[PDB]
Amino acid sequence: SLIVTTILEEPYVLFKKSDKPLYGNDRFEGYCIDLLRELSTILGFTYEIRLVEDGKYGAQDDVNGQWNGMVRELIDHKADLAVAPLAITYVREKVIDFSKPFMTLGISILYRKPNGTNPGVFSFLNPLSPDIWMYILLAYLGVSCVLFVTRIVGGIWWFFTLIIISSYTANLAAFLTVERMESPIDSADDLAKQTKIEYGAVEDGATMTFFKKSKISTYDKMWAFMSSRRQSVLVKSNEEGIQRVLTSDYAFLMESTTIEFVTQRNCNLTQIGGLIDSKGYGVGTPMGSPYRDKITIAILQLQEEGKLHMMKEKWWRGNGCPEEESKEASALGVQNIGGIFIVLAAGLVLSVFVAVGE
Amino acid sequence: LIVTTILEEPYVLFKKSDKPLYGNDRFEGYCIDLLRELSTILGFTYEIRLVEDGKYGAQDDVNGQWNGMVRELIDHKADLAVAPLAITYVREKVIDFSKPFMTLGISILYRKPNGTNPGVFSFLNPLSPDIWMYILLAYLGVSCVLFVIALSTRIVGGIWWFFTLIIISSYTANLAAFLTVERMESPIDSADDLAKQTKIEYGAVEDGATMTFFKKSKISTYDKMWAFMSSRRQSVLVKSNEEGIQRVLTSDYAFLMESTTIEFVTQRNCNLTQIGGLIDSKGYGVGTPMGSPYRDKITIAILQLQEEGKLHMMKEKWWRGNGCPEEESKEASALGVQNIGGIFIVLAAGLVLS
Amino acid sequence: SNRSLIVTTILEEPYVLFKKSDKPLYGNDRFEGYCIDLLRELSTILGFTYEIRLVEDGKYGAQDDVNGQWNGMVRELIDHKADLAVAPLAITYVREKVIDFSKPFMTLGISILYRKPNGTNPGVFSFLNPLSPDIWMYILLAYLGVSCVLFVIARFALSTRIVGGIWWFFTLIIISSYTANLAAFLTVERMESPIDSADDLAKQTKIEYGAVEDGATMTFFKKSKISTYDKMWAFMSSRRQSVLVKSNEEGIQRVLTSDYAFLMESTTIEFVTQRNCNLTQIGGLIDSKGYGVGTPMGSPYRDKITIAILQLQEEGKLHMMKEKWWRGNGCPEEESKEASALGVQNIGGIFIVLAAGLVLSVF
Amino acid sequence: NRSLIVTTILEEPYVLFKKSDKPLYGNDRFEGYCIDLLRELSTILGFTYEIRLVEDGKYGAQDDVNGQWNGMVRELIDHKADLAVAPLAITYVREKVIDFSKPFMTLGISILYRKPNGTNPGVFSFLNPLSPDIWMYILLAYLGVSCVLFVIARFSTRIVGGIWWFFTLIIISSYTANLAAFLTVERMESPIDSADDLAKQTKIEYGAVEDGATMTFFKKSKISTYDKMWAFMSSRRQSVLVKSNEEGIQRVLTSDYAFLMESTTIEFVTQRNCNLTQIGGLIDSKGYGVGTPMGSPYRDKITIAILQLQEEGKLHMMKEKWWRGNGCPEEESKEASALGVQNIGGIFIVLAAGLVLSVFVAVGEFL
């Protein structure tokens, strides 16, 4: 008799194909309903899973007063228990006394993973153009042959070496300084004062609503940019935004749980900052029925022992991810400077060969 | 039926002819071609009337009023008006517009990057010429002292080593500072580069729908640009574009103005380049009173033209005919030092001295 | 003249505290501090026979709109149990309407406490940062190999010229790479600057900054009409319960243990900075609310105290009293504040390495 | 309520005649922070006000010849002026004669000093990027290397050479990098940072206004940091002291100077002139306030009005309104400057010293 409303969400409620179609609750398989099954094994009761016909989320309507979404399946209290991805908003808390949230999270920014631009083993050749290097070699041969056939030539050679050292060091220092000045990522959670890396969120979603009703010095300018180019940055759904991020320089703003889910599904995306908003996901009941307190105490007794961590991991691992740097220093790498080692070894071995040849 | 056009230079001029003309089939331009194509495809015959009063649309926002070019040639004087203008709140509240035909946006005029690479440009640059003479005479003095002498050799070698270490460190450090200074500044200033810098000046037509977009729509970089423009109301602001092109032609100026005519200017004058792409979005259309008597025919014609593709080719040909040559084709600047040959020429001089 | 003057005070560490003595002590002798010194100066200027009577409510005056009743020092002043409430007690309109104050014996305001910018200065091996340790081992083995091959060639002059040239080129590349990397490392440090204003801290979002959950150091922001302060109040309101700590000491702990920039009255800020390092007052002064001495409305003492306070301001002994009670204890903990803008004092401890190489080369 | 007549000084940042003086003759004659403060007071408290300048254009100063007063306190004590809304500094000598409302603004002594620009001494131009201890350590290491080489000659063929090469390349790289960072960033800093820093030095002469608030405060200061300042000022009573204020500003603009002013006019000048800047924060903590005759009932309400203005933020609004006249022009876009003679000059002197030392020891060797 305990009807539980559900909504199909990629990391929360899934309709597994399995081998053959099933009927009832066994066909449905997802993190939320699995947690409900466990707490039903703990707290003794039955539950019947019911989906929402409309499939939309619950929010205040501009010209109706009544709310569409699960609220349509909640206005007449036809859903005894409501588990779904539901941010605890002001109006939702006003009308539903939501239990303690399962998760605490907020909107977070998503970005394409900054690939390491490897310039090859011969990276030390960059500061001076190769033509200048050929000039250096021809000058070396010229000064050597002139010396073969002494104060003036020695002084001019020393001055030339002076100039070459100075120029090479100046170019390399300028290149490394401009590389280090700009951060490999954008201004973390501070895409203001940038106006070049286009950023956007879902169209008229929870993130869009939050940015609309925000007055912080960074987020108000972010919302101004949102509204200025709404037809471009805003996307219909999460997958379209992810595809746009993959195909072009685009920063998305999505729920943090979805950000970690996606960035763990594939390692081509990263979460720059995180928790730039305060909200939570937890179940509730439209009426002040006494069993929501039982739900809260079930949540507390489930959290007092370690069981939700493992299910959260096994649900949000997906495939593996290659190791990535966390505290790499500013020191030159082997891949960045190994060219001089290689050329020195080659020069040494050819010198030995031509010495033993005669 | 009755239509109204605009007097702006980029879309139409006053074509010279002996026949008495007042704006009926005796002009030229892309707007004239658009109007004639619409009339022919829709079969509409009428008279075309020029601008009576107002430039770009007179605005009287002191009491929410607007008279010139907007309420004297669009609403009541003429039933319709194909006047090329942007769509904004003050117009679209009552004067409706068709779906956009071209997307208008402001981009930046800039000086074309010219590469000056003197042979002796950085060989004697970081060190002052007086310092160059000083180090030459110091070398001469230490050489003559060594000649006079030939222990003191250890101390003279040590002081020479200390001096040469300092002079190399100073020279290399100053060259690195110069390179860093010239490299931190963007090789081409973009929609965000101008805001963060102050050496390069930017401006546009005073309240010519450009800084109207800047006063509202508070974007961080855009707010910084608007503050900088308001700081210098004349120093960084130019009165129009007909002389703004000449101003930006030889100066450090940047001129913010719409994409179509900046493309026209860059094509007709390759000496100036365009940067930034559609940083703001604005659409074209036609004037329309309350009721839209002839919206159906114009919408049908423009959607048929969009599905036809004739607009794309007419746009390309008309806006490229003045710019058939393209001087800028493979613009690219090397990051490393190029043609720094002063050290090579002095090495050659030293070699031939012997 | 022959009447005891009852005064009240609260336990604020910089201002008034119980005298540090294991032996029990009673009366005015048991209280000591800056405000106690001020009261002693007032007593020795005017004619006072004063006894300190600690406020039982343990709070400052607050207009309780539930019943329209005061509390703490202000309410204690309304009924003349004590007629001189000398204490850290801000001059506010809600108080000044109901109670009567003298001139501000010191002016303060809201200011931001921020942890000093940590730098990678410590470490005698900081000169080896630009080149990775594996690269250093590669350099050492290349030096050993080139020495060995040169010795072999000598044992066994075009080849000598070639090996000399290749070694010179290798040294050229390695020294230029090291110089360039260390120059970039020391240039990006001077390139970035810490925030030293309220505008800079309000524009940013990474560095959290919030006031205390009960004091008036946030109530100014709530009623503030200035753009930047209103924006930062909106920011800290959007992230309440996380950047609005309950008490000052846990705010200091959070600042020490996190990228948190606390925000409270300037006197406490400078007291903390002099007493404890690692923290500085980055902002100058946001608000301005001087303290004062309590006084019942129908009491001439205020006026006289007014004059007395001004007397001290003319004598300059208020300045030295504040220095003694604020900076005097911080003298042992005075920060180095080196005048050298380079900040390169023994960054690279290569002298020790050179000495070790020399003594090993002595053989 | 009759009409309260206020007496006001003509201090520049606080009270100015209206720019259109020819057609204005009413209460709109005067404009300034004090004037619109009084306007806000009339908006918040019901009373009409008539502005009158003090006759002699002076502040209230005690006249010791007969015990009388000098300026606008004279008509306060005689009830000739109901209010004195003006920059009346709250002082003990005045408070015994008149009643001051609680300060609407707090000020004090501060150092006006020229904004640093491109300049650098000779030897310290290149000695700066390394600490003098590091230079002495380098010299000691060079001497040690020389004596170790002498011992080796008298008794490592290449090990000492290699370690010395490593040491010298590390030192040259560090020096080059540090001076490159200095040239790229160019983080200018004033020689003085606080009062004690200016007290210790003697190259930059001080400044004040003779028979002014600053000089009187410095006299009889008895503070260990300001008694030396008073002694230095007494050393040259004609040079460092300035008979006026604009004269002192011009002097500090046109020459090396460390003038001393009230913080309000300090910030007014620094926001009006980019060449100048403020040092020391606050030395004294003098407060302003409106003046009233003793026993005037309006003090207890005008202090309430001032506290309201300060709490609601309108005081800060009118403060920021008429002290940022144009803002600070910051460009930071000029750094392509070569090493001139001034930028690096000490190297010629040190090499000449080395040369003369070498020739002296050479001619002494023949002995």
Ligand SMILES: *[C@@H]1O[C@H](CO)[C@@H](O)[C@H](O)[C@H]1NC(C)=O
């Ligand atoms: C790799 O990084 C570069 C540098 O920003 C940029 O082109 C882009 O983010 C990546 N390029 C790819 C994935 O082709």
Ligand SMILES: *[C@@H]1O[C@H](CO)[C@@H](O)[C@H](O)[C@H]1NC(C)=O
């Ligand atoms: C080269 O470009 C610069 C930058 O505007 C300027 O000196 C000038 O426009 C050009 N110099 C010429 C044409 O000699």
Ligand SMILES: *[C@@H]1O[C@H](CO)[C@@H](O)[C@H](O)[C@H]1NC(C)=O
């Ligand atoms: C040192 O720097 C680190 C940088 O991550 C930061 O924890 C803080 O600024 C400093 N911490 C301590 C304990 O000094």
Ligand SMILES: *[C@@H]1O[C@H](CO)[C@@H](O)[C@H](O)[C@H]1NC(C)=O
């Ligand atoms: C400052 O931070 C350091 C680093 O954690 C710590 O050791 C020290 O106790 C702190 N306080 C000081 C130096 O007063």
Ligand SMILES: *[C@@H]1O[C@H](CO)[C@@H](O)[C@H](O)[C@H]1NC(C)=O
């Ligand atoms: C730079 O400062 C010196 C300080 O003596 C001053 O004489 C000179 O006029 C200043 N130059 C400027 C501000 O251009």
Ligand SMILES: *[C@@H]1O[C@H](CO)[C@@H](O)[C@H](O)[C@H]1NC(C)=O
């Ligand atoms: C003073 O005026 C401006 C403000 O900084 C400055 O550019 C100028 O060089 C200065 N001139 C003198 C003589 O100090």
